[PDB]
Design an enzyme around this catalytic site. Structure first.
Site, PDB file in Angstrom:
ATOM      1  N   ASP A  35       0.836  -1.215   0.000  1.00 28.07           N
ATOM      2  CA  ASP A  35       0.000   0.000   0.000  1.00 28.07           C
ATOM      3  C   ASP A  35       0.859   1.249   0.000  1.00 28.07           C
ATOM      4  O   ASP A  35       1.434   1.601   1.035  1.00 28.07           O
ATOM      5  CB  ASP A  35      -0.888  -0.001   1.268  1.00 28.07           C
ATOM      6  CG  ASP A  35      -1.717   1.267   1.334  1.00 28.07           C
ATOM      7  OD1 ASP A  35      -1.985   1.918   0.318  1.00 28.07           O
ATOM      8  OD2 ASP A  35      -2.134   1.663   2.429  1.00 28.07           O
ATOM      9  N   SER A 199       0.089  15.764 -12.167  1.00 23.49           N
ATOM     10  CA  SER A 199      -0.102  15.414 -13.581  1.00 23.49           C
ATOM     11  C   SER A 199      -0.250  16.639 -14.451  1.00 23.49           C
ATOM     12  O   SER A 199      -0.864  17.627 -13.980  1.00 23.49           O
ATOM     13  CB  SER A 199      -1.209  14.416 -13.720  1.00 23.49           C
ATOM     14  OG  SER A 199      -1.514  14.149 -15.100  1.00 23.49           O
TER      15      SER A 199
END
Length: 330
Positions: A35, A199
Protein backbone atom coordinates in the site's frame (compact mmCIF):
# COMPACT_ATOMS: atom_id res chain seq x y z
CA UNK A 1 20.90 -6.83 -2.79
CA UNK A 2 17.56 -7.06 -4.59
CA UNK A 3 14.22 -8.84 -4.36
CA UNK A 4 11.41 -9.77 -6.72
CA UNK A 5 7.92 -10.92 -5.77
CA UNK A 6 4.82 -11.87 -7.72
CA UNK A 7 1.66 -9.96 -6.86
CA UNK A 8 -1.79 -11.38 -7.63
CA UNK A 9 -5.25 -9.80 -7.75
CA UNK A 10 -7.51 -10.98 -4.92
CA UNK A 11 -10.55 -11.44 -7.17
CA UNK A 12 -11.74 -11.23 -10.78
CA UNK A 13 -12.31 -7.47 -10.51
CA UNK A 14 -8.70 -6.54 -9.56
CA UNK A 15 -10.01 -4.98 -6.35
CA UNK A 16 -6.57 -5.30 -4.63
CA UNK A 17 -3.19 -7.15 -5.15
CA UNK A 18 -1.63 -9.42 -2.51
CA UNK A 19 2.10 -10.31 -2.28
CA UNK A 20 3.51 -13.10 -0.10
CA UNK A 21 5.82 -11.93 2.68
CA UNK A 22 7.94 -14.06 4.98
CA UNK A 23 7.88 -13.03 8.62
CA UNK A 24 9.93 -14.56 11.40
CA UNK A 25 12.27 -17.54 11.81
CA UNK A 26 11.39 -19.99 10.64
CA UNK A 27 9.48 -18.03 7.99
CA UNK A 28 5.73 -17.53 8.36
CA UNK A 29 4.31 -16.64 4.93
CA UNK A 30 1.43 -14.12 4.98
CA UNK A 31 -0.24 -12.50 1.92
CA UNK A 32 -0.03 -8.72 2.47
CA UNK A 33 -1.49 -5.78 0.47
CA UNK A 34 1.42 -3.52 -0.58
CA UNK A 35 0.00 0.00 0.00
CA UNK A 36 1.82 3.10 -1.20
CA UNK A 37 -0.73 5.29 0.57
CA UNK A 38 0.25 4.38 4.16
CA UNK A 39 3.34 3.43 6.18
CA UNK A 40 2.44 0.65 8.57
CA UNK A 41 3.34 -3.04 8.17
CA UNK A 42 0.40 -4.59 10.20
CA UNK A 43 -0.71 -8.26 10.26
CA UNK A 44 -3.42 -10.58 11.63
CA UNK A 45 -1.78 -12.41 14.56
CA UNK A 46 -2.21 -14.78 17.50
CA UNK A 47 -3.07 -11.60 19.43
CA UNK A 48 -6.09 -10.58 17.29
CA UNK A 49 -9.52 -10.99 19.02
CA UNK A 50 -10.62 -14.45 17.92
CA UNK A 51 -14.13 -13.47 16.77
CA UNK A 52 -12.57 -10.86 14.40
CA UNK A 53 -10.46 -13.49 12.59
CA UNK A 54 -12.00 -15.31 9.50
CA UNK A 55 -9.80 -17.48 7.31
CA UNK A 56 -6.81 -15.11 7.31
CA UNK A 57 -3.36 -16.53 8.06
CA UNK A 58 -2.00 -15.20 11.37
CA UNK A 59 1.53 -14.24 12.57
CA UNK A 60 2.43 -15.93 15.86
CA UNK A 61 5.33 -13.98 17.38
CA UNK A 62 5.85 -16.71 19.99
CA UNK A 63 6.80 -19.15 17.26
CA UNK A 64 9.50 -16.83 15.85
CA UNK A 65 12.98 -17.11 17.36
CA UNK A 66 13.90 -13.67 16.03
CA UNK A 67 10.84 -11.72 17.28
CA UNK A 68 11.33 -9.09 20.01
CA UNK A 69 8.50 -7.14 21.69
CA UNK A 70 8.92 -3.38 21.27
CA UNK A 71 8.20 -2.43 24.88
CA UNK A 72 5.61 0.31 25.34
CA UNK A 73 4.90 0.81 21.61
CA UNK A 74 1.30 0.78 20.29
CA UNK A 75 -0.32 1.74 16.98
CA UNK A 76 -3.72 2.77 15.67
CA UNK A 77 -4.67 3.42 12.04
CA UNK A 78 -7.83 4.25 10.02
CA UNK A 79 -7.92 4.30 6.19
CA UNK A 80 -9.72 6.37 3.57
CA UNK A 81 -12.57 3.90 3.43
CA UNK A 82 -13.11 3.97 7.23
CA UNK A 83 -11.47 0.67 8.07
CA UNK A 84 -9.20 0.57 11.10
CA UNK A 85 -6.98 -1.64 13.29
CA UNK A 86 -4.70 -1.23 16.36
CA UNK A 87 -2.29 -3.32 18.49
CA UNK A 88 1.30 -3.48 19.80
CA UNK A 89 4.61 -3.92 18.00
CA UNK A 90 7.33 -6.52 17.50
CA UNK A 91 10.58 -6.32 15.54
CA UNK A 92 11.39 -9.42 13.45
CA UNK A 93 13.04 -10.54 10.24
CA UNK A 94 10.92 -9.79 7.17
CA UNK A 95 11.66 -11.05 3.66
CA UNK A 96 10.09 -10.13 0.32
CA UNK A 97 11.14 -11.84 -2.89
CA UNK A 98 14.53 -12.84 -1.47
CA UNK A 99 15.29 -9.39 0.10
CA UNK A 100 15.67 -9.72 3.89
CA UNK A 101 15.56 -6.90 6.48
CA UNK A 102 16.28 -7.62 10.14
CA UNK A 103 14.67 -5.66 12.98
CA UNK A 104 11.68 -4.62 10.83
CA UNK A 105 8.77 -3.34 12.95
CA UNK A 106 5.88 -5.78 12.49
CA UNK A 107 2.68 -4.31 14.01
CA UNK A 108 0.54 -6.98 15.63
CA UNK A 109 -3.23 -6.32 15.44
CA UNK A 110 -5.17 -6.84 18.65
CA UNK A 111 -8.46 -5.74 16.96
CA UNK A 112 -9.53 -5.24 13.33
CA UNK A 113 -12.57 -3.63 11.81
CA UNK A 114 -15.32 -5.62 10.17
CA UNK A 115 -14.18 -5.06 6.56
CA UNK A 116 -10.83 -6.68 7.46
CA UNK A 117 -12.46 -9.69 9.11
CA UNK A 118 -14.69 -10.17 6.04
CA UNK A 119 -11.82 -10.18 3.52
CA UNK A 120 -10.29 -13.63 3.81
CA UNK A 121 -7.53 -13.04 1.23
CA UNK A 122 -5.69 -10.13 2.93
CA UNK A 123 -3.55 -11.07 5.92
CA UNK A 124 -2.39 -7.49 6.65
CA UNK A 125 -0.78 -4.50 4.95
CA UNK A 126 2.80 -3.47 4.05
CA UNK A 127 2.98 0.32 3.89
CA UNK A 128 5.26 1.92 1.27
CA UNK A 129 4.60 5.65 1.78
CA UNK A 130 7.03 7.97 3.66
CA UNK A 131 7.71 6.95 7.28
CA UNK A 132 6.27 10.19 8.57
CA UNK A 133 2.82 8.57 8.24
CA UNK A 134 3.69 5.57 10.46
CA UNK A 135 1.24 5.30 13.37
CA UNK A 136 3.50 3.73 15.99
CA UNK A 137 3.81 5.75 19.21
CA UNK A 138 5.76 7.13 20.94
CA UNK A 139 8.51 6.72 18.31
CA UNK A 140 7.53 6.12 14.66
CA UNK A 141 8.93 3.03 12.90
CA UNK A 142 10.52 2.99 9.41
CA UNK A 143 8.87 1.17 6.47
CA UNK A 144 10.30 -2.00 4.84
CA UNK A 145 11.59 0.26 1.97
CA UNK A 146 13.39 2.60 4.36
CA UNK A 147 15.03 -0.23 6.31
CA UNK A 148 16.10 -1.88 3.04
CA UNK A 149 17.57 1.15 1.28
CA UNK A 150 21.05 0.71 2.85
CA UNK A 151 21.57 -2.69 1.27
CA UNK A 152 19.57 -2.15 -1.95
CA UNK A 153 21.66 -2.07 -5.17
CA UNK A 154 19.71 1.11 -5.90
CA UNK A 155 17.21 2.95 -3.62
CA UNK A 156 14.20 2.11 -5.72
CA UNK A 157 11.19 -0.10 -6.09
CA UNK A 158 8.92 -0.77 -9.03
CA UNK A 159 5.24 -1.61 -9.37
CA UNK A 160 4.17 -3.78 -12.28
CA UNK A 161 0.48 -4.44 -11.69
CA UNK A 162 -1.35 -6.77 -14.05
CA UNK A 163 -4.75 -6.31 -15.73
CA UNK A 164 -6.65 -9.40 -14.66
CA UNK A 165 -3.33 -11.19 -14.21
CA UNK A 166 -0.34 -11.40 -11.85
CA UNK A 167 2.33 -8.70 -11.81
CA UNK A 168 5.57 -7.92 -10.03
CA UNK A 169 7.04 -5.81 -7.33
CA UNK A 170 10.82 -5.39 -7.53
CA UNK A 171 13.15 -3.83 -5.02
CA UNK A 172 16.56 -2.39 -5.76
CA UNK A 173 16.54 -2.52 -9.56
CA UNK A 174 14.72 -1.57 -12.73
CA UNK A 175 13.84 -4.39 -15.15
CA UNK A 176 14.30 -2.95 -18.64
CA UNK A 177 12.47 -5.88 -20.22
CA UNK A 178 9.27 -4.97 -18.45
CA UNK A 179 8.24 -1.83 -20.32
CA UNK A 180 8.49 -0.08 -23.68
CA UNK A 181 10.09 3.28 -24.52
CA UNK A 182 11.80 5.16 -21.70
CA UNK A 183 10.75 6.08 -18.15
CA UNK A 184 9.70 9.69 -17.56
CA UNK A 185 10.43 10.96 -14.03
CA UNK A 186 8.35 13.69 -12.28
CA UNK A 187 8.93 15.46 -8.93
CA UNK A 188 7.38 14.17 -5.67
CA UNK A 189 6.18 16.35 -2.79
CA UNK A 190 6.54 14.62 0.58
CA UNK A 191 4.71 17.41 2.47
CA UNK A 192 1.70 15.20 3.23
CA UNK A 193 3.81 12.03 3.43
CA UNK A 194 2.45 10.50 0.16
CA UNK A 195 3.97 9.75 -3.26
CA UNK A 196 2.33 13.00 -4.27
CA UNK A 197 2.83 14.43 -7.77
CA UNK A 198 1.29 16.75 -10.33
CA UNK A 199 -0.10 15.41 -13.58
CA UNK A 200 0.24 17.77 -16.57
CA UNK A 201 -3.26 17.13 -17.93
CA UNK A 202 -5.44 14.59 -19.68
CA UNK A 203 -7.35 13.55 -22.80
CA UNK A 204 -10.44 11.41 -23.38
CA UNK A 205 -10.49 8.90 -26.24
CA UNK A 206 -9.06 10.45 -29.44
CA UNK A 207 -9.78 14.08 -28.53
CA UNK A 208 -7.57 16.89 -27.34
CA UNK A 209 -5.07 16.91 -24.53
CA UNK A 210 -5.97 19.56 -21.97
CA UNK A 211 -3.05 21.00 -20.01
CA UNK A 212 -4.36 21.36 -16.44
CA UNK A 213 -2.50 20.60 -13.20
CA UNK A 214 -3.79 17.51 -11.42
CA UNK A 215 -2.20 17.07 -8.00
CA UNK A 216 -2.73 13.42 -6.98
CA UNK A 217 -1.06 10.56 -5.10
CA UNK A 218 0.07 7.26 -6.60
CA UNK A 219 -1.67 4.66 -4.42
CA UNK A 220 -1.36 0.95 -4.97
CA UNK A 221 -3.86 0.32 -2.12
CA UNK A 222 -6.82 2.13 -3.76
CA UNK A 223 -8.76 0.26 -6.42
CA UNK A 224 -10.09 3.02 -8.64
CA UNK A 225 -8.89 6.25 -10.35
CA UNK A 226 -10.37 9.29 -8.61
CA UNK A 227 -10.17 12.60 -10.45
CA UNK A 228 -11.74 16.07 -10.00
CA UNK A 229 -15.48 16.20 -10.74
CA UNK A 230 -15.16 18.19 -13.96
CA UNK A 231 -12.52 15.88 -15.43
CA UNK A 232 -14.62 12.82 -14.59
CA UNK A 233 -17.73 14.45 -16.07
CA UNK A 234 -15.88 15.06 -19.36
CA UNK A 235 -14.92 11.39 -19.72
CA UNK A 236 -18.33 9.93 -19.10
CA UNK A 237 -20.00 12.53 -21.36
CA UNK A 238 -18.42 10.39 -24.11
CA UNK A 239 -20.37 7.26 -23.02
CA UNK A 240 -23.97 7.33 -24.12
CA UNK A 241 -25.58 5.08 -21.48
CA UNK A 242 -23.42 6.34 -18.60
CA UNK A 243 -25.02 8.20 -15.69
CA UNK A 244 -24.27 9.13 -12.09
CA UNK A 245 -26.09 6.79 -9.71
CA UNK A 246 -26.74 7.98 -6.15
CA UNK A 247 -27.71 4.49 -5.08
CA UNK A 248 -24.60 2.67 -6.34
CA UNK A 249 -22.32 5.59 -5.42
CA UNK A 250 -20.90 6.63 -8.81
CA UNK A 251 -20.85 6.60 -12.60
CA UNK A 252 -22.39 3.44 -14.07
CA UNK A 253 -22.73 2.42 -17.75
CA UNK A 254 -24.17 -0.45 -19.85
CA UNK A 255 -21.74 -3.39 -19.63
CA UNK A 256 -22.37 -3.50 -23.39
CA UNK A 257 -20.53 -0.24 -24.22
CA UNK A 258 -16.94 -0.01 -25.52
CA UNK A 259 -15.41 2.69 -23.30
CA UNK A 260 -12.96 5.35 -24.59
CA UNK A 261 -9.36 5.34 -23.40
CA UNK A 262 -8.19 7.93 -20.87
CA UNK A 263 -4.76 9.58 -21.18
CA UNK A 264 -2.92 11.32 -18.36
CA UNK A 265 0.16 13.48 -18.70
CA UNK A 266 3.44 12.91 -16.89
CA UNK A 267 5.60 15.91 -17.83
CA UNK A 268 5.72 15.71 -21.62
CA UNK A 269 4.85 12.01 -21.70
CA UNK A 270 1.40 10.45 -22.03
CA UNK A 271 0.14 7.31 -20.29
CA UNK A 272 -2.90 5.75 -21.98
CA UNK A 273 -5.36 3.68 -19.95
CA UNK A 274 -7.30 1.29 -22.23
CA UNK A 275 -11.08 1.71 -22.04
CA UNK A 276 -11.36 -1.91 -20.94
CA UNK A 277 -9.35 -1.10 -17.77
CA UNK A 278 -12.09 1.45 -16.81
CA UNK A 279 -14.75 -1.19 -17.14
CA UNK A 280 -14.76 -2.28 -13.61
CA UNK A 281 -17.45 -4.83 -13.92
CA UNK A 282 -21.14 -5.53 -13.35
CA UNK A 283 -22.58 -3.87 -10.25
CA UNK A 284 -23.99 -7.35 -9.54
CA UNK A 285 -23.46 -10.80 -11.16
CA UNK A 286 -25.67 -10.94 -14.24
CA UNK A 287 -26.48 -7.20 -14.24
CA UNK A 288 -26.57 -5.25 -17.47
CA UNK A 289 -25.08 -2.22 -15.65
CA UNK A 290 -21.34 -2.01 -14.91
CA UNK A 291 -19.44 0.26 -12.46
CA UNK A 292 -16.99 2.87 -13.84
CA UNK A 293 -13.29 2.77 -12.97
CA UNK A 294 -13.04 6.61 -13.04
CA UNK A 295 -14.96 8.40 -10.27
CA UNK A 296 -15.03 11.83 -8.60
CA UNK A 297 -12.53 12.61 -5.82
CA UNK A 298 -14.77 15.52 -4.69
CA UNK A 299 -15.83 13.57 -1.60
CA UNK A 300 -12.39 12.17 -0.71
CA UNK A 301 -10.63 15.59 -0.77
CA UNK A 302 -7.67 14.29 -2.80
CA UNK A 303 -7.07 12.87 -6.30
CA UNK A 304 -5.88 9.26 -6.28
CA UNK A 305 -4.00 7.56 -9.15
CA UNK A 306 -5.11 4.10 -7.94
CA UNK A 307 -4.83 0.60 -9.45
CA UNK A 308 -6.91 1.39 -12.53
CA UNK A 309 -4.21 3.97 -13.54
CA UNK A 310 -1.13 2.25 -12.16
CA UNK A 311 -1.73 -1.09 -13.88
CA UNK A 312 -1.60 0.58 -17.32
CA UNK A 313 1.97 1.61 -16.52
CA UNK A 314 5.32 0.45 -15.23
CA UNK A 315 5.88 2.58 -12.14
CA UNK A 316 9.18 3.53 -10.53
CA UNK A 317 9.23 4.68 -6.96
CA UNK A 318 12.62 6.41 -6.66
CA UNK A 319 13.32 6.75 -2.93
CA UNK A 320 16.58 8.73 -3.20
CA UNK A 321 17.06 11.63 -0.76
CA UNK A 322 15.00 13.74 -3.21
CA UNK A 323 12.42 11.16 -4.34
CA UNK A 324 10.82 11.03 -7.77
CA UNK A 325 8.15 8.90 -9.56
CA UNK A 326 8.87 7.37 -13.01
CA UNK A 327 6.10 6.23 -15.45
CA UNK A 328 6.69 4.17 -18.63
CA UNK A 329 4.17 2.47 -20.97
CA UNK A 330 4.26 -1.32 -21.07
Amino acid sequence: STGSATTTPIDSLDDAYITPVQIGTPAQTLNLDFDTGSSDLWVFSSETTASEVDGQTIYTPSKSTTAKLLSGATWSISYGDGSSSSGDVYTDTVSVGGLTVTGQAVESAKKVSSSFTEDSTIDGLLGLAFSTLNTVSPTQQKTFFDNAKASLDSPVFTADLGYHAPGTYNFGFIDTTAYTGSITYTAVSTKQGFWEWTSTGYAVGSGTFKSTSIDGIADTGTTLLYLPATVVSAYWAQVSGAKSSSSVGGYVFPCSATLPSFTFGVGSARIVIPGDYIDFGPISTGSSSCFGGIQSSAGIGINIFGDVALKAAFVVFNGATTPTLGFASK
